[PDB]
Amino acid sequence: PALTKSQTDRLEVLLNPKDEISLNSGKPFRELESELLSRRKKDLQQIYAEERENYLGKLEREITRFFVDRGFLEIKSPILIPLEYIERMGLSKQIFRVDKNFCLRPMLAPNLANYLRKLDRALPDPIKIFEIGPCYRKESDGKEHLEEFTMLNFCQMGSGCTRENLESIITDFLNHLGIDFKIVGDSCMVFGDTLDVMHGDLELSSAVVGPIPLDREWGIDKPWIGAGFGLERLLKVKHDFKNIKRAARSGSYYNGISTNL
Template identity: 70%
Template sequence: MERKPLDSLISKTGLWVSRNGHLHGIRSCETSQKYIRITMDCGEVIQVRNSRSSRAARSLRNHKYHKPCKRCRLAEDRIKEFSNKTSRKDEVRVTVRTVQSSQFNSARSEIPDMTVLSGDLQPSNTTKQPAHRSPAEKPQPAVAQTFKPQSRTQQPKITKPTNHSFQKHAKPEKNEFTQTQKNRILSLLAPNEMISFSKEKRSFAELESVLLTQRKKDLRTMYEDSRENMLGKLERTITEFFVDMGFLEVKSPILIPFEYMERMGVGEDKELSKQIFRVGDNMCLRPMLAPGLYNHLRKFDNVLPDPIRIFEIGPCYRKESDGGNHLEEFTMLNFCQMGSRCTRQTLESIIGDFLDFLNIEYEIVADSCMVYGDTIDVMHRNMELSSAVVGPIPMDMDWGINKPWIGAGFGLERLLKAKHDFKNIRSVARSESYYNGICTNL
């Protein structure tokens, strides 16, 4: 059976079940795309999500409540009808009015939290008093009323009070964090912070509160000091470096024909094609910058002076988000030089000058890949920063290139992770959850 959303159940029953089980009548109800604002007959106003599986939705769907609200003054027939689960399908007790989200949210600050209902928090006196009592009669203690006089032969045994002074004091239980709580705490840590959950003495609520306060302070400090996004700032720094080195900056389309990937040796029959985001039948989001650079080199050949030096910085997309070093959307830097002096020594010299400029430690190792064959990998500890190639290679003829060339590609997010020792690459990527490595889900 399909579960109806909360506004549908309210419209059908005209009733509301609060958290403490009190059954309320509904005077009016307004709904936006996500929320519902409900005004009770007793005057209380609450705001809740329009959910199919919330506690309130289950209570209304199953007709469960503790007792009716006294201030709402519900009629007996409405309560009986709700309890017997025989409400008529064609009856609409409450008109649910749809309002714009902006109008709905503007009044949100004036609405009390749904967990605080003044009508439901009245203390109840459950102690029953005698029906008749003379003025001279004094109330007897409850203990005296529970025992009757007994004969000596039936005297109860007197139990000696336990001497608690000899009992061992129970050791305080060790704080244990669930995996969800651990992930939340780790997301709130700054890049230079560490934590040991096995030695942590604070509770999750206390620890989260401390970290939230510090992260808010960090974000305010960033706003007052620099106001520069790390990823954008690094892109501008790299652009300035390569322009000063004599490279020409180019910008290629992000949406490219899938034919370009076939020229790169990544056809539909290849395993790597599963990492490509297809758009329609013939287009895709570029997973690399190489196709655009190939086209620019061919068009600039015999126009620009030898050697031709170009670079590009831009977003790329691959279906490989597993692990702490991969992203589905990432920013690439590719530089290449075509013509004279295209040797491995020149390539390693450019890479060395670039990483020294960024103050990042590295080492160069030999490797190979399906697209380019033999490559030169640039490593920072166990993380690959770049894959570099010394051409020519066989696929050059498919792009109309017939001269020697050298080139390398770097992931900007990995450069930031290496430079600032970030634990997770997502904290420095294009994100709405982080700003410069600081969590914004506060």
């Protein structure tokens, strides 16, 4: 007997990377579904009994410890921001607008630029800060983009803002998480030349060595470096998820396990 598309989709929802189950092995849908429901119930029961931590929250906490311990100040800035923060940043069709003059932030950079400028009046060189939190863009497009995702951005301004120090921070960070990567040359319209941090064909991060001409519009007038990483992409690599939706804030998956059981 052959599986319908609806049946295959249901089994794919219930399958996890650790399974070694063939959906097209001739076993009827009913037995594959019952087997996978039992395994996923067991998996959630184990999480509930023994760990109880959300993957996104736990990764945020692990990242926070890494950067606080290396001298970076932890920032929590608004998610709902002025629409004016563009074209002050220079996408475009991807912005979720809110009322008339606001939007959901698509990136952390504008608030962090404001903090770098302000903190440089008070703190010793170099200024090192980071933020982790939700960002929003109109794009889902399958297995690597979410509309609601979680960004880490760290940055430094003053001394030590060289390409080699930027690459060394990225290397120490991804070594800490156990993720292999390479660095490639890329570009974008906001920052210009970028380094891209790649895991295979998956972009984990865009990183920048300043100064860039945009600095003047933000009152930034010292060398700087910084990088942005999406946490759901990190989780996708760490847990070998086929689709990034497994990693997202959602009511449909808990730690990559279907909640429809």
